[PDB]
Symmetry: D2
Subunit: 332 residues, 4 copies
């Protein structure tokens, strides 16, 4: 399938890296009004977090050429003015953070594209998570969402645990790395005041919808989960801390067995498992959605427990975008 | 009342700063084999976290003089070889991290001191927390402990909540700043392998006894609490995240009213209260033990809730050491 | 004397802090289209780098009131649409970073202000540096500039050394803390590509005009100095490293004596001197423009030498703005 | 040639990585009293800066097995008690930082080893630098030194420039990343006071012998160079800033040509060259000793210039150790 990209940021660029890594998806066009053709070369070649690109990159005849495949470049602010059709782009990835409703994202179809994928949650487009509800996707749907990074970590874990023991109620905290909507020194952040204070200096509390959204993707758990977040001064990689009460009694060692079996069968590639003494930098550029840390958790008794799971928020999420589009294309 | 210090580190120096500010406690001797007389002047004058000392500091006749008070300096590795009595030291503060049992800390009395206070938890000496059980102290006790920084934050908050609504069960996480037992780059750390990885780079999980210890200080809650910790890259100030279940039903607003009343009456100076949009740097050099953040917490139901409280782990703890010794002395 | 502020950022707010502390300058109006009235209270009360404000701050009748003085608030993007005169603002401080030429800054006079001071270098307005050329100011000048933070550190030091021994030639490097034009993660930065890479992760080279500009402020040194900069991951405080060649021979001790004498006489308050073992945090909220570090420098010969000087780039500069306006007003 | 390692730290472990990468050197024994057999596996597998080892690692029959080669493990404090001979170790790498003179390092020959290489400067063993004086090595010599990380960056650059234009005099500064002799919070550091202040918080000045040592390795430049250092809060990668005066006149573009030619001929693999807009993270795990940055430097005139060169202090240096031992072995 042939693909386009709107917004060449952290997610936009890493999705592009992943597609050339696989060879199931082919990238044929890119739009970003604030990055010119020569500046694109530089930003794709060099990366502070994940390292130099292994391959070749240059500019020839007004196009971007990676490993020898030529790509068409555009520079528009309004999405209705982009000529996707002429270039041959059948699916579009929307990753600017500015167009997350159905009305707004709809503008792409006007330029001659078939379907659109939003790289964030949505107030009204239907949400999917690979491993959990992806089989509910249908070819009547022209606009869809891949949810948030945090929701892709929490959802696979809660499904296994709910199926085998049963969840009565629960509360979540995430300790999360820094992103591009934060600030270097104290400053203006609009309506959300704590989010504008110095990012290199502070621990910062913040809101999250990620836990209530599990209830859309798993109906049975609707109304039984919620949570919050802290932002801390590391540049990539994050962690989930889930505290919950169970229906059926369960020793800690029984919980471990069930999680390892799922990682070796149906959820291979998505949910991992480990007993080593790891820390955050050990998961930099890891491709899983969720990895269970067996040593770091604890139980008060047979009905009340605390569980711990790690995730690369940039590079894990990027690879789930590509997987989603492949599934979709097999149902055309 | 006149006092001695064994260990001139982060706690040892800041206790000394607090006592000169207050003026009920008087410091008359100091022991540290690794810091000579001229080096002591430099370390007390300048501080990276809390700033310059306002006052005068100099060296005269082989003694350390601050605002005109002369202090006797010693350099011994073995605590039994030290002559406290001769210098006139009636209480000793033990803050080296190496002598935390009753056998080991007992050596100070062989040198002619009356009573000893350990600045950390203990396997066998009795523990106290101002505001919670300090009225159970009595004259027969020669060796005592002031517990940990985390236990001084959690204990006051749980006593209010247990008294008014009742705690059935609960689980705790603390997000904590870096300390002097960590390492600048990957290296050896003994039995705890995760503790030696790079402190400037990582989020690091670790164990903590601070929640079980609440059960010794408040007998009724023995066996109903436990928890863990993460270490993150800030130089000072930490936070508690308590998830718990209640006996009597309670709306969020009712919980707020009960906490504000306690802060304004019998726990004034120990427990604070706030509704402003705060972050970690806002509590640097604050003197409270625990401050409730009303905006950051959340409730699932009338029986299931998440509560949030801040603490300066260096400077809050230092001031509680001083308060304890005053109580003690006024009962001799 | 009564004054206005256009741009309530890091400099705009700290100038305001300095004036209330001193008491010769009085603030009566403030303009910032992106910070509303209630948001202003919060940003002035709490500060990550310098700490809480000691005083009272509140909102009453649509005006901002600090220790009982009411201030008029405006919200305009175009500086010509602003009514300075009506509020009683005789001088205006221009600290947005967007209006640094004479055409552009001229718009403030159309609103009824007398004189304007630009808080940055300028292509065409005349530049002044207290201690060096401030006595050349005169009444005919309606628009002026206070130069950059780096130029206020270098200029006083070079004038002493040129007067006593003579400078043939020289080259400068500054190691500088992070500012608000940098980025949290890899991203777009216009014409300067290196400036947009992750600020928490990297050492970053950049250009600076600060050394050539010394040649406008001291005509005799025109064409004999230039330099560059590196940006590093601290939140405040910077350092100068000057390498130079001399006309008259000079031992290191002779250089020290000449610098101490100037600090104790005609440059008191501007140029400091020290022989203690200092580091960067020791100068946080210091009010000098330049402090000579005697231990850190070194000489190859009696004609070839390396000199080292520290500066608080936020709070030192803020106090020089206030001093300039006093001089000006006492000559009306 | 068969090789042993004393001190399994940052350098000790990365040298071991490099030798299995090449296949010119074979590692057969390791000594470290503070890291037991099972702890060695963990520290070699996982790395915060350079990433997971690509290969296999396990423990079998009391030995360490990497990619299937078995290695003998020892646990001694005194180097005279190690049985190098029995294990078959013909050369020994000394990387503890405690044994840097000829007397002290001599103890290894008593255990039955042939020659020793010190991974640091030395008060009396003879020093070498690949690319510059390695051809002066002789088979009469039993104990030798590979100099410091900084000296391996400066020396190759100064040789090219001195040969083509001539150096009359010069002064150096290095901006340098953090290491394991620093501290997480303010504390005791012995005789060097600034070196014990908080490493995550400050810019710290320090001494260096690296520039005078160039005069041993290049006799003609003895007495014409010296310098100093700043330490800053990044975990790896450093930079050199050399300011110097020339004999023969030279335009900037002439200096560039000469440096590029040397990088493509005799000094290929040791000295690099670049015109792109790079920053520090772009050189993480780079194998060169010195890379010239052409955009970042500047000239005041035809006789007076400032030059800039980057270096991975951990991973560049490690690969030069291995190269030295190969050369040596060809002269047996
Ligand atoms: N950073 C993460 O870990 C992460 C994880 C999951 C989801 N996301 C989501 O992905 C989106 C972007 O995240 P990001 O981290 O890549 O931000 P980013 O700033 O790194 O990237 C955004 C890009 O959008 C471009 N852009 C802006 N306006 C545009 C327009 N009108 N037309 C075309 N291009 C435009 C910018 O030039 C920029 O390159 C957000 O909605 C975010 O919620 C981020
Ligand atoms: N920093 C905190 O958050 C905190 C809070 C509460 C309690 N504590 C506890 O206080 C104790 C001290 O902590 P710190 O943070 O000051 O550590 P630190 O390393 O800053 O201080 C320890 C000091 O003890 C000295 N020392 C070592 N051996 C000695 C001996 N034989 N005689 C005299 N002095 C000796 C060292 O030179 C050093 O000055 C620890 O047990 C710690 O757990 C720390
Ligand atoms: N921080 C330093 O070290 C330093 C030192 C000396 C000089 N300066 C200079 O001072 C100037 C301001 O610097 P800063 O560090 O406070 O930046 P900042 O971003 O902290 O402050 C800029 C402020 O200007 C406001 N602004 C933008 N457009 C405006 C408009 N039309 N009207 C009114 N306000 C507007 C923003 O909301 C913001 O509050 C810059 O030119 C900078 O170069 C900075
Ligand atoms: N870090 C760098 O960038 C760098 C660069 C060039 C040279 N060096 C030099 O290499 C040496 C070590 O540097 P490092 O960064 O690897 O320090 P490190 O702490 O990382 O490694 C030192 C190791 O020595 C072991 N050790 C200590 N005493 C011992 C003994 N008696 N016997 C056996 N083993 C012992 C320790 O257990 C530790 O593993 C120093 O001399 C340093 O100057 C370092």
């Amino acid at each position: 399938v042939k693909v386009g990209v709107n917004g060449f940021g952290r997610i936009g660029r890493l999705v592009t890296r992943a597609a050339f890594n696989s060879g199931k998806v082919d990238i044929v066009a890119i739009n970003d009004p604030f990055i010119d053709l020569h500046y694109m070369v530089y930003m794709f070649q060099y990366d502070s977090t994940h390292g130099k690109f292994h391959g070749t990159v240059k500019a020839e005849n007004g196009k971007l050429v990676i490993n020898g495949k030529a790509i068409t470049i555009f520079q528009e602010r309004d999405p209705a003015n982009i000529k996707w059709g002429d270039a041959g782009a059948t699916y579009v990835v929307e990753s600017t953070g500015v167009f997350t409703t159905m009305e707004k994202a709809g503008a792409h179809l006007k330029g001659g594209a078939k379907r659109v994928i939003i790289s964030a949650p949505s107030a009204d487009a239907p949400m999917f998570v690979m491993g959990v509800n992806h089989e509910k996707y249908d070819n009547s749907l022209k606009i869809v969402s891949n949810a948030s990074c945090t929701t892709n970590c929490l959802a696979p874990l809660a499904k296994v645990i709910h199926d085998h023991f049963g969840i009565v109620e629960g509360l979540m905290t995430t300790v999360h790395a820094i992103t591009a909507t934060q600030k270097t020194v104290d400053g203006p952040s609009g309506k959300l005041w704590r989010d504008g204070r110095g990012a290199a200096q502070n621990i910062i509390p913040a809101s999250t919808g990620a836990a209530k959204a599990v209830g859309k993707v798993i109906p049975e758990l609707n109304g039984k989960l919620t949570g919050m977040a802290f932002r801390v001064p590391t540049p990539n990689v994050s962690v989930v801390d889930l505290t919950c009460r169970l229906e059926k009694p369960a020793k800690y060692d029984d919980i471990k067995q069930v999680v390892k079996q799922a990682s070796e069968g149906p959820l291979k590639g998505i949910l991992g498992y480990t007993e080593d003494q790891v820390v955050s930098c050990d998961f930099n550029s890891d491709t899983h959605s969720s990895t269970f840390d067996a040593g770091a958790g604890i139980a008060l008794n047979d009905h009340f427990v605390k569980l711990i799971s790690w995730y690369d928020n940039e590079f894990g999420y990027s690879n789930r975008v590509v997987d989603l589009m492949v599934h979709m294309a097999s149902k055309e």
